[PDB]
Nucleic acid binder design. Structure first.
Lengths: 68, 68
DNA sequence: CGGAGTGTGGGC
DNA sequence: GCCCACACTCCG
């Protein structure tokens, strides 16, 4: 998967939470974000490198997609 | 390429093939060949083929060597 | 060679 | 002992 708009980010950005199905890490989740283009981001600093000074991410909680 | 892999049984060979282009340019895929010449691309496929007959607990697929 | 899915280890 | 951040596998 479900791609969910992320209101804390600019228009068309979506957040997805994928539960790991197998191996040693099973049941833990990974959070991905997608750009309006469709590009996949897997961490906060990756997200900041792409967005730069268009969005203040200092207080942005990558996991929940909420500003704090 | 094709080199003799000593930590597997008589006549197994390892092969490494450098990736030529793209985002993973310069990384390598490792392949194995049994005495028949059936190609193996991963440790689960290899383990499935060999079964109980060869102990791959400690087998590191990339280097081709058993590790403590 | 890509890339979803799982492994990995430093910083905490 | 956890988890961020990214490296790696493994099969398409």
């Amino acid at each position: 998967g479900k791609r969910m708009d992320c209101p804390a980010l600019p228009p068309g950005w979506k957040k997805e939470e994928v539960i790991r199905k197998s191996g040693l890490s099973a049941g833990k989740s990974d959070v991905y974000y997608f750009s309006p283009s469709g590009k996949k981001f897997r961490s906060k600093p990756q997200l900041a490198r792409y967005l730069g000074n268009t969005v203040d991410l200092s207080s942005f909680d990558f996991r929940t997609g909420k500003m704090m």
